[PDB]
Design a protein around this nucleic acid. Structure first.
Ligand SMILES: Nc1ccn([C@@H]2O[C@H](COP(=O)(O)OP(=O)(O)OP(=O)(O)O)[C@@H](O)[C@H]2O)c(=O)n1
Ligand SMILES: [Mg+2]
Ligand SMILES: [Mg+2]
Ligand SMILES: [Zn+2]
Length: 462
RNA sequence: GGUCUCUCUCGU
RNA sequence: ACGAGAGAGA
């Protein structure tokens, strides 16, 4: 991805979009009980913690575009992936606006607790003023689609979240592109059935982990992914995507049966307009992260990416022996022979992609179940039943979360959630985490889950 | 102050 | 089942 132009809002006639500049994150009562190295991300340009210009740091992620049209590796890759998807028999028919707005069994309803985007957000119009859970009224929605139409600009806000100190010093906060409700609706109508299929089928046919539940999914993955593991990270995936991957996405969609009107919508996320503050800017390439389908399309593109890299980097690849599961840019994959990722990475560079050793190691090492991670979790066989696999969120990560809150009112819920993540690491580590939580007055006021209950509730899932 | 997923909690 | 809230992940 690459910023094509920037114009003031006077010149484009776009309403300014300003977001908050103060973090809602405050240190929790456990801040000094656990060690951690993250803080609230830089939200404002005059943040004393800065060491670089903010805005230039924020937008440096648009590293530019290499390929615009599919070469022959990418084509072959798209087709292999699309043929794989066909057995799922995705219903390419348009989803009704009522189902799109208000949801189904395999698609959650549009979030009514979340902004409505351009232009409503500047007009004081919330999602709740157009949609109603109980009514399932679609009438005002239709009315607004007509008034403001589609392809409305994304609103750019900075994400309020904890970031490692290095990224705070270097102003590398993340940006989210707040969709217009109109585009969300329309994209859900076009692909809601695809969404439903993906959510209902995490695994190696979708090649996706969206919809997965780590407690139960981590036990399938060594069966789903037989042979030699490989994995890596992308640096700035969404923005690093060149238009070719959107061309590629299109070919997959066509091949599984989408109408050209349906397929045409891809170009409207490949080429987007964004309002950040008082300006309008144009982005060519790059997933507008915040659009409907972000996760699924990233996952799909990722599947295309992996195949294309493999048959370009190596001789005699059999794509049919490829297994992979993607969650956006997060990948875990296997093949009957070990795959050298340093070379995949060299090839990816030519495509504008930046690929780094699993977990930000210094170098590309062997990936095995003992050191693999996916969705930040490790893989740890249960000592009693070794075919049942724990997803292990590292305690260091759990320590970062607990040291802050955005509202201490919900402390109880927060610590409980962490415990649900922590116990997988084992009895000894878990009680250590609990005893440290207990070491402080608020901590002694909290209901903390009993370990063996957690374990036995885990086992009962199977 | 986005798209989504998973899980938990509290209600009726 | 329907409502509200939270955490986590991409
Ligand atoms: N809160 C998030 C996090 C991630 N993503 C999507 O998932 C991809 C991968 O996210 P991640 O690997 O966690 O971050 P990067 O964007 O690769 O890294 P950076 O922090 O450098 O931007 C992104 O490209 C983005 O499209 C997202 O939509 N929302
Ligand atoms: Mg990445
Ligand atoms: Mg990973
Ligand atoms: Zn443009």
């Amino acid at each position: 991805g690459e910023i094509q132009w920037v114009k003031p809002n006077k010149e484009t006639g776009r309403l300014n979009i300003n977001g908050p500049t103060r973090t809602k994150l405050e240190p929790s009562v456990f801040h000094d009980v656990f060690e951690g190295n993250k803080e609230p991300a830089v939200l404002h340009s005059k943040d004393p913690r800065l060491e670089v210009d903010f805005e230039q740091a924020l937008f440096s992620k648009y590293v530019g575009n290499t390929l615009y049209e599919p070469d022959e590796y990418i084509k072959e890759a798209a087709l292999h992936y699309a043929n794989q998807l066909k057995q799922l028999d995705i219903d390419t028919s348009q989803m009704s606006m009522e189902e799109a707005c208000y949801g189904t069994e395999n698609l959650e309803a549009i979030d009514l607790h979340t902004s409505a985007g351009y232009p409503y957000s500047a007009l004081g119009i919330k999602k709740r003023d157009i949609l109603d859970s109980t009514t399932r009224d679609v009438s005002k929605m239709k009315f607004y689609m007509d008034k403001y139409g589609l392809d409305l600009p994304y609103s750019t806000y900075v994400k309020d979240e904890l970031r490692s100190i290095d990224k705070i010093k270097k102003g590398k906060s993340r940006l989210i592109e707040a969709s217009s409700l109109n585009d969300s609706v329309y994209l859900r109508m076009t692909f809601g059935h695809l969404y439903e299929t993906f959510h209902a089928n995490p695994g190696t046919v979708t090649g996706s982990a969206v919809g997965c539940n780590p407690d139960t999914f981590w036990s399938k993955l060594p069966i789903l992914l037989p042979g030699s593991l490989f994995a890596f990270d992308y640096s700035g995936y969404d923005a690093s995507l060149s238009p070719v991957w959107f061309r590629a996405l299109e070919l997959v969609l066509r091949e599984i049966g989408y109408s050209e009107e349906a397929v045409s919508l891809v170009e409207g996320i490949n080429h987007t307009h964004h309002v950040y503050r008082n300006k309008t800017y144009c982005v060519l390439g790059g997933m507008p992260s915040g659009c409907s389908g972000t996760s699924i399309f990233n996952s799909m593109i990722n599947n295309i990416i992996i195949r294309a890299l493999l048959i370009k980097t190596f001789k005699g690849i059999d794509l049919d022996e490829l297994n992979m599961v993607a969650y956006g840019d997060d990948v875990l994959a296997s093949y009957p022979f070990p795959i050298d990722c340093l070379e995949l990475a060299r090839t990816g560079k030519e495509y504008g992609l930046t690929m780094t050793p699993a977990d930000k190691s210094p170098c590309f090492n062997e990936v095995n179940w003992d050191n693999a991670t996916f969705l930040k979790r490790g893989f740890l066989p249960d000592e009693q039943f070794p075919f049942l696999i724990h997803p292990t969120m590292p305690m260091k990560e759990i320590h970062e979360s607990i040291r802050w809150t955005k509202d201490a009112r919900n402390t109880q819920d927060h610590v409980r959630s962490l415990c649900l993540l922590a116990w997988h690491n084992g009895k000894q580590e878990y009680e250590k985490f609990v005893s440290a939580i207990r070491s402080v007055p608020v901590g002694k006021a909290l209901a903390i889950p009993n370990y063996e209950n957690l374990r036995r509730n885990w086992l009962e899932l199977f």
